[PDB]
Every structure is written in C-alpha cells, then in structure tokens.
Write a protein that binds this DNA or RNA. Sequence first.
RNA 1: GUUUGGAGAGUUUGAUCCUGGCUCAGGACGAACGCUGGCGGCGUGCUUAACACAUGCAAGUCGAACGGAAAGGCCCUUUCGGGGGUACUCGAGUGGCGAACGGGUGAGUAACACGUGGGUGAUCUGCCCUGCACUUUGGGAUAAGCCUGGGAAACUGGGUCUAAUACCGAAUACACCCUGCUGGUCGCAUGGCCUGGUAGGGGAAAGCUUUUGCGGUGUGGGAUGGGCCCGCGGCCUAUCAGCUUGUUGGUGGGGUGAUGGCCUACCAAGGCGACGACGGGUAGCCGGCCUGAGAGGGUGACCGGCCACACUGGGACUGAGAUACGGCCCAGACUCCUACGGGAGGCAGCAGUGGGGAAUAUUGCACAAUGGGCGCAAGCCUGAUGCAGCGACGCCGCGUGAGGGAUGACGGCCUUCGGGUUGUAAACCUCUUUCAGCACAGACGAAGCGCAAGUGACGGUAUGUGCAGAAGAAGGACCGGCCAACUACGUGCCAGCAGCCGCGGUAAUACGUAGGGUCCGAGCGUUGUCCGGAAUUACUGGGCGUAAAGAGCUCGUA
Lengths: 200, 85, 113
Amino acid sequence: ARYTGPATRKSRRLGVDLVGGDQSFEKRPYPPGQHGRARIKESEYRQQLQEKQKARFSYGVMEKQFRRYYEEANRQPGKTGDNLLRILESRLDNVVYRAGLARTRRMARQLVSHGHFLVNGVKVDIPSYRVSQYDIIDVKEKSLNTLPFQIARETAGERPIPSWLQVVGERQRILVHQLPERAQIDVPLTEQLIVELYSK
Amino acid sequence: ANIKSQIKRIRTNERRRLRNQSVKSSLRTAIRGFREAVDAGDKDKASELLHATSRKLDKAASKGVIHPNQAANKKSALALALNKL
Amino acid sequence: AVKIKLTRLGKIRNPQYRIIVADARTRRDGRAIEVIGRYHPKEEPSLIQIDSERAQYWLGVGAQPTEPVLALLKITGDWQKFKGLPGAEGTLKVKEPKPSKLDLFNAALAEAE
RNA sequence: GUUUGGAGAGUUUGAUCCUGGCUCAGGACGAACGCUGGCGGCGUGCUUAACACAUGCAAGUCGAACGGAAAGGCCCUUUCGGGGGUACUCGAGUGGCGAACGGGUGAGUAACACGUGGGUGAUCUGCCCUGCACUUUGGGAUAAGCCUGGGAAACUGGGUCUAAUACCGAAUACACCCUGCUGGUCGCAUGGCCUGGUAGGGGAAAGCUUUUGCGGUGUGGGAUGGGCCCGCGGCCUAUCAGCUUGUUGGUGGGGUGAUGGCCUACCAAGGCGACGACGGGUAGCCGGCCUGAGAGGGUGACCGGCCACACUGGGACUGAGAUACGGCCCAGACUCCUACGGGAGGCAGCAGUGGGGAAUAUUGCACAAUGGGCGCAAGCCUGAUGCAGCGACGCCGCGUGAGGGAUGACGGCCUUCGGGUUGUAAACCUCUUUCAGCACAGACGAAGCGCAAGUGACGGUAUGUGCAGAAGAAGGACCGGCCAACUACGUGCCAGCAGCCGCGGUAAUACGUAGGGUCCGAGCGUUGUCCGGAAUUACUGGGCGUAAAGAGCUCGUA
Ligand SMILES: [Mg+2]
Ligand SMILES: [Mg+2]
Ligand SMILES: [Mg+2]
Ligand SMILES: [Mg+2]
Ligand SMILES: [Mg+2]
Ligand SMILES: [Mg+2]
Ligand SMILES: [Mg+2]
Ligand SMILES: [Mg+2]
Ligand SMILES: [Mg+2]
Ligand SMILES: [Mg+2]
Ligand SMILES: [Mg+2]
Ligand SMILES: [Mg+2]
Ligand SMILES: [Mg+2]
Ligand SMILES: [Mg+2]
Ligand SMILES: [Mg+2]
Ligand SMILES: [Mg+2]
Ligand SMILES: [Mg+2]
Ligand SMILES: [Mg+2]
Ligand SMILES: [Mg+2]
Ligand SMILES: [Mg+2]
Ligand SMILES: [Mg+2]
Ligand SMILES: [Mg+2]
Ligand SMILES: [Mg+2]
Ligand SMILES: [Mg+2]
C-alpha cells in the first residue's frame, strides 16, 4: 500500500520540513487538529518514535518494509544508523529525486512505478529497487518528450545533486559512482534515535 | 486378490512352497537316518550315509532351497559327529 | 544398482538439477552418496558442470547413468573418455560472459563527456 | 584472544526503603474468531476420530522365454455365410523380472527406537561393474486348448491334450563347500592370513535372436544396500524399594547369513538396584524450528534422514530382500451378498463422502520435465512427480494517483461569538496510465525424446507492443498511566468498560456516540499457545539473625 492522504499534516505533527517547499507548514508549524496547540508531556519514547516517522514518511516506506531495512542495517558491518540511511538512499525513487528529474519523492515514486526508467538497459518499475555501484539509469524513449519530463529538463536547479549521483546528459542520464556515506547524506533527522527505538 | 499380478503370484507362491517343502523333508529324513546310524554305532553304515546326506545337502543349496552357509553348517556337524563317534 | 541421477532443486518453473550418485531405489530428493555436478536447463546454453575425476571413478565401478545424465556425459566428453571412444574433448558450450559493470560505467562517462 | 551484544512500567503505605508475587509493552504460529478486502510472486492447508467409508484411479511389463490365435493387419477364398493360412500383430494362459521401491500415517515404542562415534578375527547382498572357467547329456509332466461334472454365487472336480529360458536325473567344475593331516607367517584370546601344501567326499547352466543383437552357470574382486554388537547423549514420578529362576554364568547339542539363553538338556548360584533397579505417567527420534545478549527455555507443522504400523490380534509362506498398505492363512468386530449350504470387503495412496471439531481444499490436467518398474529396442506403466483449482492461512512486492492550487469555500465539530479546527484538504487547472480493463504478438523450461521427421501438462498462460481515462481499488484498532494520540454531548454506582491499578453516585480526556487525533494498512484487532521481560530455579546469574528459608543436637555409611 501507499500513504496518499494529506502531506502537510505529517510534517506539521513532526515539526520538521519533509517536502521542504511547503508554505502551509511554515504558516502553521504546530501539530494538526483541534488540540494541535496544546502542551504535550515530554517522553523519550515519543522522541524516538517521531524520528522514525520522519524517516519513513520522508522516503514513503511502510513500517513493515522499514523494519526489514533496520534488520539489514543492523546485520551489516557498519554502524546501524549510517547503514539504515544509505539503504533508504539506495532506493530508486529516492535516487530519481536526488537526481532532480522529479519535484517530490511522491512524484519520483509515481514516475518509477509507471515505467519511465531503465537500469542497466532493463526496465525497472520497482520503487524500492536498491541501486548499487556503477548503476546507470536512463529514460525510455516515449517518456523523454513527455511533458512533465520536459519540465524536469529545464527546471534543473531546484536542489543540489549529491556527489555520488551525476547527471551526465541532456537525456537525463544518472550515474552512481558509489553508495553515499553518512557525510554525503543530508537528511533532517537524528538516526541514533531510530536505532534506539528498535532496541526497545 | 485385487491386482492381476498378485492373483497370479498366489498360484506361483504355492507351487514353490510345495517344491521347497518336499526337498526340505527329504533333507530332514536323510539327516535323521544318519543320526540314527551314529546312535546305533555302525561306523560303516554311518560313513556311507554321511556321504549321501552331505551331497544331498549340497544339492539343496544349489536349487536355492537352503542357503549355502546352512548347508556348510549341516555338513560340518555331521562329519564331526562321525569323527567323534 | 547404483545410478547417476538428476535431483531437482530450485523453485516452481525454475528446475535446477544436481548430478548425484544414488541407489536406484532411493527417492529422487533423497540422500545422495556424492554430488558430482550440476545442470541448469533454464539457462542458454543450459549450464553444465561435471567433476570429471569423480564421474570417471563412478562409471569405472559400474554406476549406471540415467538418460539425461548420459546426454550430459557425452557433451562433457566424460562418456567418450570412459569408453575409449573419441570425442573426449566434448562439445560443452559456455554462456558468453556479459560486459563488466565497471567498463560500462567508464563507457557512459566517456560517451557523455 | 574480543565488543556487533542485555531498556523497563504499574500495583502493599499517610509517606518511605526493602522483600515479594501479580500484570503489561516484544517476538512467534500448520491457527481459529470479529470487522474489512484490489492485484500479483513464492510458500502452505484434519493439530480433532490409528473414527466409518459410496465411486473412480494409485503396479505393471516382456511375442527377442513358450504353446498358441479371441481382436486388429496382410494373403487366399467364396455362396458371403463364413472358412483356412501367415505370424507383422496380440485377448486369455504358462514362464521371467518388478510388485519389499515409490506414497500414507504417528497408533505403539522410554527401546541400541533415534543422534553421534566405533566394532564385525561374528555376517548377508537380486539387478550393476570388472577378471577366470564353462555353458555336456538325457527325461517325465502340466496350465492354455477340447469334452464333461458339481455350485445360487464365489469358485471348483474329472477326462483328453500341448510347449518352454517352467520342472527333474546324470557328467564335467577342482576357483568353491565339508572333513583329516601338516608348513610358514600376522596378531586381538576365540583366531585371521598365505585362493599355503596335501589326502578323501561333494556342489551348476538355457536358450532366443538376425538385430545398436540380447541372454544362462560357477567362481575371484569391486560397487551398492543392509544385518548384528558396543561407548556416549536427549522426559516426569519413591505418596514406585527391592526385582529376576532361561534368570545370571558354564559345557554338550540345536538354530541363523552371522555372534549370542536365540533355543534346549544338564551343571554352578548367580545377575540388576538409591550413579534409582522394578513399577506408574507421558511421548515416535533427529537435521532443524521459535524465543533469547548469551547460557538456557520451549518445540519437532512443511522440507530432508531414520524408526514404527497398515480394520484388531496371531502366524508363516514366496523371495537377494517382507511391519508384505492396494498378497496369503486363522481368530474377532463391523459392512455387504445368498438359493441359508456358503460367499465377499479393509482410503494411516490421490481425489472425494459422512462424522467429530473453533478449524484445514478439487470425486482437476499431463506423463512435456526429473526419479522408478519391465522391455534388445520402439514403447508401455507411474494420483512418485511436474503443474493447475480453491482458502489474505503465511511471507514478500506493487497499486488505490502526481504536480499546482487560498490568508483559505461548503458542510461537520469545538468556542472566551474574536474565531479555531478539519485543511492544500476539497473544488477547480494541468500531468502519468503502474496494477486491473480492450486489442495484437507470444516464450524459456527440450545440446531433451523419436530419429521419424513428429513431440510442452502448465498455456495463447508469463512476458512484450498498442488503445481509453483518475478512470475500477481502504479499512481496522486505539486515544487515564504503562503507551503514540482530547475535547463536546448522552445517561449518574445505571447502562456499561477493564490486561493491571482502577473508571460509572445528574458538571466522566476510562461508559456510549460525534468531531478531532494517533498507530498500523489489504489488512487491523481478539482468543489460544510458547519464549522474553522474570537475576521469579539464579551454570553464566539469587538467597536463609528479624522479610520465605539452618535439621533440636551429635555420631557416622555412601
Ligand atoms: Mg504488505
Ligand atoms: Mg552348528
Ligand atoms: Mg492426523
Ligand atoms: Mg498377450
Ligand atoms: Mg512398503
Ligand atoms: Mg530353470
Ligand atoms: Mg555351540
Ligand atoms: Mg502416541
Ligand atoms: Mg535472559
Ligand atoms: Mg526364503
Ligand atoms: Mg488401501
Ligand atoms: Mg504388495
Ligand atoms: Mg484421503
Ligand atoms: Mg461439525
Ligand atoms: Mg524417465
Ligand atoms: Mg532410446
Ligand atoms: Mg493404470
Ligand atoms: Mg502519550
Ligand atoms: Mg530465567
Ligand atoms: Mg509470562
Ligand atoms: Mg530473592
Ligand atoms: Mg549461611
Ligand atoms: Mg522468617
Ligand atoms: Mg541450630
């Protein structure tokens, strides 16, 4: 399944920019609903939980799949928080967003899912597809002149492109030289709280 | 009784039982006669019937009615009895 | 009789077979005496590997191949060798190794720059 | 050596500290139940009654063993009613091999059943592989056929007749089996080896085919599959203390493939037990699985290996091999047939029915692939198996749209009557059709098989290429503290809630509804069950002055 309800109310509850271009958040930075102004009792569990919610509602990953990501990250030899972040960064819908061909991670998901991209010459419509070193991502012929993709070509500049990604052509060809290290990744989140949440 | 091959095997098992039973009886009579000869004490008769009984044991092992090792055991016991007595 | 059989591994619609030495009576997916090879028909060319040293031993002692295993032993030349007939080199085909990923990355770098 | 790995909270008091139980948050399932429900991939599905079983299938095959000629075929022949021949072919029958595998179930079993490691100088092994020798010679039958009898049926008798790779006698074998004598050598005591040497006695066979030609007998070695013995290991119960007389040991016989009270006659009086004998209860065991920081605890569904059983109990026969599931004999229970004399059955194979239960599927499609049986082979057989159908039963993946959109509509709900929430949400304006839908292409699995040249059950499925349009696609639990998420109204110790502490007594963040919120999402909750938290049986890792706990005190056996 996907979460398709209002997007602003999630950033408002969590008190941080998820889309990062959202005027309605800055207008009402408090949580939603009738009681969104009221004082909330502090607790360590709520802090840990909301960092997890920021991660999964930024990247658009359901709790089931996110928990599998955690176990893999913890199993991997690095430090769990770095591994978890770079696994979610390896997602193809995320790589497309980081490349700039999409406006929002929601838009990136739809594009990948609808079958507009190819990886190493083979069509992939799996948003959760994890890119690896030296993957090449291309756009199919039909979608190259496609009106929102045309917009994407001449709308370069919205955000910066990270060093591990590289767009090399006007064809909008994306190359991945390596998986991002924690320094490379730039996300508004404290990953150590999520590792602690799942150690409960 | 349900399967054709089994019904046929009923007939054939019976045929083989009769053949084997007859041979085993003959062997048993021969060994008995030798035993009685040895318990009577007549070295000559006992030696003659040891040889005929021994060959009969060997031939029964050739027809597959008794195992060769069983024939060897029987032959050995008879020959030992004649040497001791 | 001890035979050389294919045992089925893999999942539905993906038959992967190990070449095993097993008693005829043993069930297909049962305990094997040795694994001496593997055979993947879903590939092109179908993947075939045989441990020729062990295949020669087992055929020497009198293991009887099954029909498909006999076809594989002829492709590998292990049958022709065991009998003395010519063709021991065999006609084994191997899948053309796909281009390395690093080289294609360099190709894309050069092409766009 | 060594980091990859341990979280707590509530509840005894006016308050406190400790001790200590109870309860909760996590994970798991062959699950069930409630609400809800789009698609696909890959798994999985009688846990109860080893209860009873309608119906169809689950083991055959060989004309290159044999006499034969019912069906086909071909050749005569015709009058067209039939009648011959052939043997390409093949019903029934004789004969060989298979039917002991494969599939099911877990009733029994606390045991060398199983796991792991050994032993066999104490042993067997069809078919397969590879050395050696051979395959001589005679004979008497019988099934089938034909005639006829008995019986309701199941079945069965007599006569006449025919064949073999069916059966039977003899020769040869001197590798082999038995006995006596005798030499060397190796050990682990019986003994083993040198096919030691030697004397005496003895042990087999089968033909067919004319083609990739298949077979037969003995014997040496191998390979495979076993048998038997032993060390060690894995349940509760002394409110179960003695048990045993083929029982413990010996010798002479018997028995087996083999060792052995395995059996038997005699002789000795032993053997096993608080390192729990003998009893009672429960249970198939294991690789593994679940949980856990680990140690440990729990468990043995699927998949894989052993074992056990096949309506209940007993027995043997055939065979290389037998718990002989779809064999046989007997006894019992039950069902059925009968002419009342007598007969016939066995789903713990696959599918299916009744029943029991909270609960578990189709009386599919193929032998195309892999494994197995027979056949020289073409081939035949295979509910093994490969697949399909059904059930969110589980795991995983994807969709139910994306961008923009205001000081922010209507409507709903709060209010300090200012407004504030729902909410960028919606409306609207453009943008992409994944998955479903409608067309047109269309597999791999087959270096296979037959070499006759055709051959894929799944399947016109999966997967590609076009078309139309946001178009068809969201629910469930929770919101007093643990524990994320609060207000109004309705009943006022009522109706009800609840895992624990506890909430309801006409102002409830705990009851019911609504608005809002939170956690999860084609699922969400509940019940049951196991581990965790529980250092709460503490080996890792706890205690005994007063909290539960030092025997009333000594002596002394293991
Ligand atoms: Mg899911
Ligand atoms: Mg004896
Ligand atoms: Mg059962
Ligand atoms: Mg016939
Ligand atoms: Mg069986
Ligand atoms: Mg014969
Ligand atoms: Mg003795
Ligand atoms: Mg039981
Ligand atoms: Mg622990
Ligand atoms: Mg026998
Ligand atoms: Mg049956
Ligand atoms: Mg049988
Ligand atoms: Mg059944
Ligand atoms: Mg019922
Ligand atoms: Mg086959
Ligand atoms: Mg062939
Ligand atoms: Mg059949
Ligand atoms: Mg809270
Ligand atoms: Mg414990
Ligand atoms: Mg507990
Ligand atoms: Mg204590
Ligand atoms: Mg003390
Ligand atoms: Mg006390
Ligand atoms: Mg005292």
